[PDB]
Amino acid sequence: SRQQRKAEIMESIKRLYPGSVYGRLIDLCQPTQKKYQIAVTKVLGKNMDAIIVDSEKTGRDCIQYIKEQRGEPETFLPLDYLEVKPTDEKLRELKGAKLVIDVIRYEPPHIKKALQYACGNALVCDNVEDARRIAFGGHQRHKTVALDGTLFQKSGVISGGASDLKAKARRWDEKAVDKLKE
């Protein structure tokens, strides 16, 4: 059971550096509705399992403690060390969509920087045609995702891949099942 020892080392680093290991990104955020569960899981990606810690010092400390325990390597986001750009406010004033970061809510309001880095100025649209329309029709193109998980990058690379996205979306409700069990 890899998840068991993963959560074991996770709780150990949670109790070692407690004012500075906020948690993973899944246990720290959830979307506004249930519809967007697919699209959010396509935009966050590996960042869903990224551990959110306060600064780079705690990052190296947790990494070396995982190495001492010979565990699975994990990904850390240091808030103070993270390179972000402020969320483009103009894109809230949009005809057919709003930003994916506005589609999710945090849990401690300090962690906003991490959700600026995992989302940026991504946008989410109801159907595929609307996503294509606001992504390519304006004079500035934007990274847009549809509700069914298809990703419209700025370069034009259409990304489809819902084979493993069903389980990644099922983790979102399985966390509620885990909360009701505990």
Partner: protein, 236 residues
């Protein structure tokens, strides 16, 4: 009168070596993955059926294989070269988009399975990267022995990551120069500040299993040649 028993024991040793090589090859194959391996077998079948008829002349000598089989480095780097490249170890290096497109036409025409990702040399922009002048970070690309004709593709995969002494140094360097940084034992720090690290084993380092397979192949070839010359001059 002592010859047949020594012959039998030498064949027992040869069979033990072949079983060892099958074990190590299956270890590499398990560390490779089912989709990548079936993709490699499928590219092999497409180019075999391609060269049976000799069509598309620059295409057949235009596929140069995977990234993993086009370089070799010192074993101390075997971890850190892997984790910053990842499954980019199994990208297919080809000259242009002509051969990629033709291979994929035959691919979905003959309906043969497997994942394949193509690196066409002709469409990788050579941004002349300027590497920092510190004593604290060696360029990773500098420690890779590869044919210079492929020099575009490796610059796409390794052309931004640096090897630093330890983690404090790499966190300063990566933020300072907008470059990826990674220590000798696998811990990374991105150019955006993303920390990634832990304990990387030597069991599933695919380059180390590759070198076990290659050394077993050289050993098996030496034993085969020696026993075959013994049998060639045992006919007299």
């Amino acid at each position: 009168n002592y010859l047949w028993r020594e012959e039998n024991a030498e064949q027992q040793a040869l069979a033990a070596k072949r079983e060892d090589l099958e074990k190590k090859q299956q270890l590499l194959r398990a560390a490779t993955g089912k989709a990548i391996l079936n993709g490699i077998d499928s590219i092999n079948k497409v180019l075999d059926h391609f060269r049976r008829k000799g069509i598309n002349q620059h295409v057949q000598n235009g596929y140069h294989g995977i990234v993993m089989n086009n370089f070799e480095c010192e074993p101390a780097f075997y971890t850190c070269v892997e984790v910053t490249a990842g499954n980019r170890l199994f990208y297919h290096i080809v000259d242009s988009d002509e051969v990629s497109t033709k291979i994929l036409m035959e691919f979905n025409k003959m309906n043969l399975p497997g994942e394949v990702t193509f690196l066409p040399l002709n469409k990788l922009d050579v941004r002349d990267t300027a590497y920092p002048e510190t004593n604290d970070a060696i360029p990773m690309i500098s420690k890779l022995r590869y044919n210079p004709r492929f020099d575009k593709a490796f610059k796409h995969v390794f052309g931004k990551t640096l090897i630093c002494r330890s983690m404090e140094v790499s966190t300063q360097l990566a933020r300072a120069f907008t470059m990826d940084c990674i220590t000798l034992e696998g811990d990374q720090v991105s150019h955006r500040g993303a920390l990634t690290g832990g304990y990387y084993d030597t069991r599933k380092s695919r380059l180390e299993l590759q070198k076990d397979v290659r050394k077993a192949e050289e050993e098996l070839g030496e034993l085969e040649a020696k026993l075959n010359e013994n049998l060639r001059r045992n006919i007299e």
